[model samples]
Target: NDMKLAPPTDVRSGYIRLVKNVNYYIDSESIWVDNQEPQIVHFDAVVNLDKGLYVYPEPKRYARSVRQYKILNCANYHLTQVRTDFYDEFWGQGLRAAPKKQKKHTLSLTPDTTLYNAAQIICANYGKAFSD
Candidate 1:
């Protein structure tokens, strides 16, 4: 298989980007992978989501796209860090709140073994059932 290559450029600062609803391989189809070493990702062009500043992530061998994930304005969106032990107990599972502008919808993610179990888990989290 012929995969593309990274950039032929460089940057002084760190690169910030947002790959909306990105997918990464793990124990299964996942968005985040827990590899000991972070893998370098090459993108044709990456956008600074939430940053209205439309600039590509530096070091443009440096490239990276997007529907605009607001990962930067964490406060306005009510996104926060977990402090209490209770919140910590809920590690990678919870009802994800979409950007304040999109209160009409909510984002969420949780681990499950199968579709049957995923439905059950999701419904239970929302305190409802996926009606047939």
Candidate 2:
């Protein structure tokens, strides 16, 4: 159902974030919101909200775990979830292992990716698909 598109104050699957858009974390413990910050959404002739009733409300904790451990290149850029961790791990994990040597690996590659082939490069070197 199409509702007025607005930034969700909550941090979870229910939040309806477009992948490659929202940043997520594994250690994060909270992102739920009570519909906090709100602004009038304007669409069409400057129109939109109150949500559409057609959507069945089945209340549940937001978002999902990193069950897939991989990114899917769909309308939603799933990789956006751990955009930070991608680089942070360099100092976070690598730094501890080798010091400044591995720091460059932590270079944040925002927007684009490391695939020699852009769109066609899916799945990492492991179990996931459409990966970096």
Candidate 3:
């Protein structure tokens, strides 16, 4: 809400195609109606199970804390996080060091869900999971 778009670069160019403009909605317990739309996301790197990166997403206006999640490993339909970034909370101030003892976030699988789609895409294109 207080910044300009970033300049294009080779790194960003490669990852642009990986983007997914997630459009979905949900209401919070206290809030009335949470209208979500086109949450832009693109994995920084989808190298390997143990080296892959994943981050819980949020839209711009409501964005606050930023994080960088690394995929530890996956099996039995669970994707785990090994490490967890900052862009001045989104305006790209700089990369801040992650917190200590970053806890695990085991992403459970459910067909047709957002996480599932992301996992499937990674597995399909990068051979990160058992191609079934």
Candidate 4:
């Protein structure tokens, strides 16, 4: 049997909320969400994570800590495209990361039940089993 995978989606380019308390722009700056009377996000400094530069807050409590920044030589963002080779390397039979080896399993169902089965398998595999 031959199975074809879907094409990769375009890179999501936008500002992303890191930890609810911090917001990092894709190509701009980083900000802190202030919890004052009027909640506002203050853009503290311009940062480029793609360039391996990160500006972090101080560790001291009440010392008016300085803006500590550093340029990392390498960092993995885990945003790579999933291709045929990816499946072969990560999920294929005999691969190091595959759950099963040399086991051929086929799931068949009627047209009306096909969607339900697919949804169940997707939920089981990715929603619950692979959750963090």
In order, the Cα lDDT scores of the candidates are: 0.21, 0.23, 0.34, 0.23
- Model 2 lDDT-worst window of ten: 39-48
Candidates, ranked, TM-score: 3, 1, 2, 4
> Top TM-score: which candidate number?
3
Please provide TM-scores, in order, for all candidate models, with all chains considered together.
0.17, 0.16, 0.43, 0.14
Q: Candidate 4, 5: how far from true, in Å?
A: 20
- Candidate 1 residues 1-132, lDDT tens each? 122333213321323221231211011112221144222111111221221211223322111112122111111212111111111001112222222233222223233422223223223333232331
**Candidates 3 and 4 compared by lDDT, better number:** 3
lDDT of 4 by residue, 1-132 (tens): 123333222322433222221222121143332344112222221112212111123222111111211111111111111111111211111211212333332232233442233223323432333320
**Alpha carbon lDDT at 84, candidate 1:** 13
Candidate 2 vs candidate 3: the TM-score winner is: 3
Best by lDDT: 3
Q: Judged by lDDT relative to the true structure, which candidate is superior, 1 or 2?
A: 2
Q: Write the per-residue lDDT of candidate 3 for residues 4-54, one digit (tens) a residue.
A: 433222332223223232221111111111123112112322211111122
User: Which parts of model 2 are misplaced by more than 4 Å?
Assistant: 1-70, 75-79, 83-93, 96-117, 123-132
How many backbone clashes does every candidate have? Answer: 3, 9, 1, 0
